[PDB]
Amino acid sequence: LPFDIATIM
Amino acid sequence: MIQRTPKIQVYSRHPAENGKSNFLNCYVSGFHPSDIEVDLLKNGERIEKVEHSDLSFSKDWSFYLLYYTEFTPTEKDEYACRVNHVTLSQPKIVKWDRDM
């Protein structure tokens, strides 16, 4: 299962 | 920008036996950036319905892809892989050698 938090760089 | 030329290997899935169905593989790896054009050739002609793996990369960030098709090797038919990449002036053709 992938990590669920996507954070803009 | 730092660009890496592809390594190319052309080989069969199973040991080659003339007249017996097998899979012809063209493995391209160690390249960057990811865009690449790969064709499998039979007597210099592009084969249709060639499939390929999903884009992935190695621990050093370089990309790799497997292109493959069903083929029946013979003594006379010549097989090859034609690759073009931003790092290449012209497409590179690598012949299938059943001892490699």
Partner: protein
């Protein structure tokens, strides 16, 4: 014994050719099990190994939502990094990310990983402590401040030590027949004359899984590292891998050469020689 799960993300800009493409692939060891491609006719998370197919609709929808959100965040990240490097709007650029967990033979977490690159160069990576970042340059320091303000490291640590290990153990159980089965290499030595006085001895290893293997040539019991031509391990296309190692030997001196093979699937390591 030892197992790992990794996700590999590639986000690629292509000015004048539409919006950036985002592709995510998931692996357990050397087996891919999922894909997501923002360029697909209908972008959705797709199964790529039979043991993942049993996952319910909620699993597939959860993955798809995560990867759709990443498709949008990576589009902003590509715009940001272009700016951090004072790059022109003309060039195509790539962000890559690889993350996941490693388990020991006991099934316990050995270590976690999270690394990102820009145009194939290390950009930002989570340290082994799962608490701090290693930023490659002043551009990556901006990302680092952003990631610290969002508490990324704390959230990633909870994932790497929690859900990552849990799901990896679930996949290992569901795919135990393949994932926990090591296929030994089928080996042989071929001989190819190159001159009147020299011949190539090629040591082959075929049909093995996982990809990790050691193939070496020794002459009178000493390693021939500099003299060995070693091809990159290559996929057969049926889950297995292939490799060969070759040495150019003086004719008549063949029996002084031995090929050594180490792989997890083998009851005991192999010692081979050319059998005329």
């Amino acid at each position: 014994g030892s197992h790992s799960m990794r996700y590999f993300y590639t986000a690629m800009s292509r000015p004048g050719r539409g919006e950036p493409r985002f592709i995510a692939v998931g692996y357990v060891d050397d087996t891919q099990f999922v894909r997501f491609d923002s360029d697909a006719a209908s972008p959705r998370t797709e199964p790529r190994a039979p043991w993942i197919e049993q996952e319910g609709p909620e699993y597939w929808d959860r993955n798809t939502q995560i990867f759709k959100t990443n498709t949008q965040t990576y589009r902003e990240s590509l715009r940001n990094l272009r700016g951090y490097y004072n790059q022109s709007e003309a060039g195509s650029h790539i962000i890559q990310r690889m993350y996941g967990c490693d388990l020991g033979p006991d099934g316990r977490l050995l270590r976690g990983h999270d690394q990102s690159a820009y145009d194939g160069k290390d950009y930002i990576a989570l340290n082994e402590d799962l608490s701090s970042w290693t930023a490659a340059d002043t551009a990556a320091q901006i990302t680092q401040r952003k990631w610290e303000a969002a508490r990324v490291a704390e959230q990633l640590r909870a994932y790497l030590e929690g859900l990552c290990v849990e799901w990896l153990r679930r996949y290992l159980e569901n795919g135990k027949e393949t994932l926990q089965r090591a296929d030994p290499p089928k080996t042989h030595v071929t001989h190819h004359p190159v001159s009147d006085h020299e011949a190539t001895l090629r040591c082959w290893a075929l049909g093995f899984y996982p990809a990790e293997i050691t193939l070496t040539w020794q002459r009178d019991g000493e390693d021939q590292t500099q003299d060995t031509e070693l091809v990159e391990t290559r996929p057969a296309g049926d889950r297995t891998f292939q490799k060969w190692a070759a040495v150019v030997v003086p004719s008549g001196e063949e029996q002084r050469y031995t090929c050594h093979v180490q792989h997890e699937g083998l009851p005991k390591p192999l010692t081979l020689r050319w059998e005329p």
